Scaffold this active site. Structure first.
Site, PDB file in Angstrom:
ATOM      1  N   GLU A   1       0.815  -1.207   0.000  1.00 16.27           N
ATOM      2  CA  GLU A   1       0.000   0.000   0.000  1.00 16.27           C
ATOM      3  C   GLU A   1       0.856   1.268   0.000  1.00 16.27           C
ATOM      4  OE1 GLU A   1      -3.071   0.441  -0.413  1.00 16.27           O
ATOM      5  OE2 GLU A   1      -3.933  -1.528  -0.127  1.00 16.27           O
TER       6      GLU A   1
ATOM      7  N   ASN B   1      -8.696   5.565   3.269  1.00 16.24           N
ATOM      8  CA  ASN B   1      -9.413   6.384   2.290  1.00 16.24           C
ATOM      9  C   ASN B   1     -10.249   7.467   2.958  1.00 16.24           C
ATOM     10  OD1 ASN B   1     -10.546   7.323  -0.092  1.00 16.24           O
ATOM     11  ND2 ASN B   1     -11.206   5.315  -0.814  1.00 16.24           N
TER      12      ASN B   1
ATOM     13  N   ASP C   1      -6.132   8.501  -0.427  1.00 12.12           N
ATOM     14  CA  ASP C   1      -5.652   7.489   0.500  1.00 12.12           C
ATOM     15  C   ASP C   1      -4.457   8.037   1.265  1.00 12.12           C
ATOM     16  OD1 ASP C   1      -7.575   5.890  -0.520  1.00 12.12           O
ATOM     17  OD2 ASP C   1      -6.214   4.554  -1.620  1.00 12.12           O
TER      18      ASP C   1
ATOM     19  N   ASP D   1     -12.490   9.042  -7.770  1.00 18.78           N
ATOM     20  CA  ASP D   1     -13.682   9.703  -7.251  1.00 18.78           C
ATOM     21  C   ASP D   1     -13.371  10.989  -6.495  1.00 18.78           C
ATOM     22  OD1 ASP D   1     -12.635   8.908  -4.815  1.00 18.78           O
ATOM     23  OD2 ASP D   1     -14.500   8.035  -4.072  1.00 18.78           O
TER      24      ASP D   1
ATOM     25  N   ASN E   1      -7.618   9.222  -5.556  1.00 18.10           N
ATOM     26  CA  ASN E   1      -8.466   8.283  -6.268  1.00 18.10           C
ATOM     27  C   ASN E   1      -9.308   8.995  -7.323  1.00 18.10           C
ATOM     28  OD1 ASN E   1      -7.664   6.059  -4.589  1.00 18.10           O
ATOM     29  ND2 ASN E   1      -8.951   6.923  -2.975  1.00 18.10           N
TER      30      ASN E   1
ATOM     31  N   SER F   1     -11.504  11.204  -3.751  1.00 16.79           N
ATOM     32  CA  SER F   1     -11.002  10.884  -2.434  1.00 16.79           C
ATOM     33  C   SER F   1      -9.491  10.669  -2.492  1.00 16.79           C
ATOM     34  CB  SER F   1     -11.711   9.651  -1.881  1.00 16.79           C
ATOM     35  OG  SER F   1     -11.404   8.511  -2.654  1.00 16.79           O
TER      36      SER F   1
END
Ligand SMILES: [Cl-]
Ligand SMILES: [Cl-]
Ligand code: NA
Length: 129
Positions: free
Chosen positions: A35, A59, A52, A48, A46, A50
């Site tokens: 990750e 998120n 991380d 959308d 991301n 958002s």
């Protein structure tokens, strides 16, 4: 902060993640590797809108507040910037809430695709824990 592999394993164990909800420590170290490459300051945006955050790429759509993810929840009740600290306590406590919500570690795409079903104990081999 960029953790070493055994350093992070030891930190996660001290914070109660070894066998948390049935996931052996190696699963958590493996997830953090893929990750964030063990970097507490990792961020990634991301599609959308958002973002991380941190060593476990938590998120902002659901788990923390970054002030720029409209209509998002803040289920760990923390600013996302707290997840970038060299102290992993906030990331670990939030991860404990995620992994307990029903889908286990499948919430971490990298875990599902790169750790699940592999020999995850290899990630803590050689560590003094
Ligand atoms: Cl393990
Ligand atoms: Cl992946
Ligand atoms: Na720490």
């Amino acid at each position: 902060k960029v953790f070493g592999r055994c350093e992070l394993a030891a930190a996660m164990k001290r914070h109660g993640l070894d066998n948390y909800r049935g996931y052996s420590l190696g699963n958590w170290v493996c997830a953090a590797k893929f990750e964030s490459n063990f970097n507490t300051q990792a961020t990634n945006r991301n599609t959308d809108g958002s973002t991380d955050y941190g060593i476990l790429q938590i998120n902002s759509r659901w788990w923390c507040n970054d002030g720029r993810t409209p209509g998002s929840r803040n289920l760990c009740n923390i600013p996302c910037s707290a997840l970038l600290s060299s102290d992993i306590t906030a990331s670990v406590n939030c991860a404990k809430k995620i992994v307990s919500d029903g889908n286990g570690m499948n919430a971490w795409v990298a875990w599902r695709n790169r750790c699940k079903g592999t020999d995850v104990q290899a990630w803590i081999r050689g560590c003094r824990l």
